[PDB]
Design a protein around this ligand. Structure first.
Ligand SMILES: Oc1ccc(/C=C\c2cc(O)cc(O)c2)cc1
Ligand SMILES: Oc1ccc(/C=C\c2cc(O)cc(O)c2)cc1
Ligand SMILES: [Cl-]
Ligand SMILES: [Cl-]
Lengths: 330, 330
């Protein structure tokens, strides 16, 4: 209440791929799943962050124990002439904004934990494991693991070969059963499943979201005012009838629909009035049939997106949080 | 008493190359040089270890502060199915044998220090520096740095790309002015001179010994009995008249001659009787002229080598040290 079958459904809905279904069902028969998701604390997050956060809300509703890793070491390793002070302010900005997002969605936070990479990634046991891994992984396997996640420059840096191992070790040191991310990370994830056992650690379940087209094609910032949300959405590409490549519809599929397993299309009387959909495939079929117009779909998103963003804007309107946003992103 | 000019002469004699003469002379004008030499604690050491130890004795006689690094992390990273226990016993075997060698040579140990890599190489500040370096060094520069020191296998391991950085950081963390090793390591040393400044650390002086041909061509072990020393030397290649490629003469040049800036060739009356040389070039010239025969040169080495080894054999004949040698090398 929820059953193991209900838990699995919530945990795995809207994913592109599940690695490790067997172990996943074994766990869910007995106890709550332990899972993490990592984000590097570089770049101001924008509305597209709702796509991962929606899965994090599903994990929490399931009853999972959920860790969010703020990967501040990776952030330092992009810009070392950026002070630890600016970096850690970006860490708090991320922490506050993630919390505000999950609060806006409305999800129990009792089993949520926040951890920074530097809390453990420079400890002696972890470091030693980094060296052990390095003496079993080839440069070739490391390079191929990082290809879709580490920016292939002119002469590549040594740091890029280390990322797949550090991310694998994260699964162990965070003591999780599973890691969630994007399908982009698949090669990092299979690298972890391959090499953790060589250090005597268990392979993890890997849950992968699809790559989802952006809402807007000046991305919508989590703190943008209503007026700028409107302006930015009216600019967004929606092609009539197009359901395969539609960032407005993907936002509904991955963020708005799962809120309540409901979505309301706002439509004038002339075209039939509002309609409430209880499965996404029904919206998709009306959109493909062109009885939901792009402008009405954008509208229905604008309203629901604004309702999501309002509590975050209010929370971040305190002097303490206003000062943080200004100092994190100067 | 000794002057800076005397110190430099002792420090730098018998080297193939000095990098950083300018800073070296600046230091020696003011204070004692701080220097280290590292050895990985894999493989039982043999008589060829006298070649580095002779330079270490010169540094000590100079008045230098000398650190010897026992690189036990590198040793672990060759064989991780070798227990930490066996590894640390090899560390003590190395420590005891190095000390015994330096005692046999007869050198003040007041400014000698022994340190193991694991005393500092897993600390948080060092590890962080390893990551900083990794975000400025290319894989290409790392690979080329390690070429003559890391065994070029089928698909290379990630661990081999890390070695040049860890060795560079050693210079900083051991707080030395200089590192001594073989000319083989030159690329590692120029890598350190190039990349330490990118972490805000000073470049070091680098003192490099030549590659010296082996005494024996069943190497002579530091604890081999007299009888086996004899047997092994009688087997060694000495070509009459050959001075450029002569491991018996290189042992004299790099180890025996520097003991007292003297060497005694033992020769029958018939061929002129013994002769005492006060410069190596005079021995070399008599050898090239074939008035010192290979068999007499081997003899003179056998005697002097046995005198070196006797105190080590006696020291290692204690039950405590006999048990160590057996357990270190089972
Ligand atoms: O365990 C972790 C999970 C997620 C992240 C986040 C992103 C990330 C960024 C990189 O530049 C390299 C990498 O491997 C991952 C980092 C660690
Ligand atoms: O600072 C140090 C100085 C010397 C040593 C010894 C040898 C060594 C062995 C390796 O396999 C890699 C390397 O870089 C060095 C190790 C560290
Ligand atoms: Cl999809
Ligand atoms: Cl020489």
């Amino acid at each position: 209440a929820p059953s193991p079958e209900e838990k699995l459904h919530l945990i795995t809905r809207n994913l592109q791929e599940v690695l490790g279904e067997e172990k996943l069902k074994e766990i869910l028969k007995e106890r709550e799943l332990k899972i993490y998701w990592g984000t590097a604390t570089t770049g101001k997050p924008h509305v597209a962050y709702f796509v991962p956060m929606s899965k994090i809300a599903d994990f929490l509703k399931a009853g999972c124990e959920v860790t969010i890793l703020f990967a501040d070491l990776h952030a330092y390793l992009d810009n070392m002439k950026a002070p630890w002070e600016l970096l850690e302010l970006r860490v708090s900005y991320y922490e506050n904004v993630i919390k505000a997002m999950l609060e806006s969605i409305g999800v129990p936070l009792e089993k949520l934990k926040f951890i920074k990479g530097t809390d453990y990634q420079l400890s002696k046991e972890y470091t030693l494991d980094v060296y052990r891994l390095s003496s079993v992984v080839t440069q070739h396997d490391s390079k191929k693991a990082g290809a879709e996640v580490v920016k292939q420059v002119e002469h590549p840096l040594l740091s890029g070969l280390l990322y797949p191992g550090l991310q694998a070790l994260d699964e162990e040191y965070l003591k999780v059963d599973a890691q969630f991310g994007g399908i982009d990370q698949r090669k990092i994830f299979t690298f972890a499943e391959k090499y953790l056992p060589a250090l005597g650690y268990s392979k993890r379940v890997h849950l992968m979201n699809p790559m989802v087209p952006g809402l807007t094609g000046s991305k919508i910032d989590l703190l943008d005012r209503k007026e700028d949300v409107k302006k930015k959405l009216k600019k967004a590409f929606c092609e009539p009838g197009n359901v395969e490549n539609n960032g407005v519809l993907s936002f509904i599929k991955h963020v708005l629909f799962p809120l309540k397993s409901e979505f309301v299309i706002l439509r004038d009387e002339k075209w039939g009035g509002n309609k409430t959909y209880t499965a996404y495939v029904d919206l998709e079929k009306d959109f493909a049939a062109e009885v939901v117009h792009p402008g009405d779909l954008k509208n229905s998103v604008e309203v629901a997106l604004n309702k999501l963003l309002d509590p975050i804007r209010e929370k971040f309107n305190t002097p303490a949080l206003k000062k943080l946003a200004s100092a994190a992103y100067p």
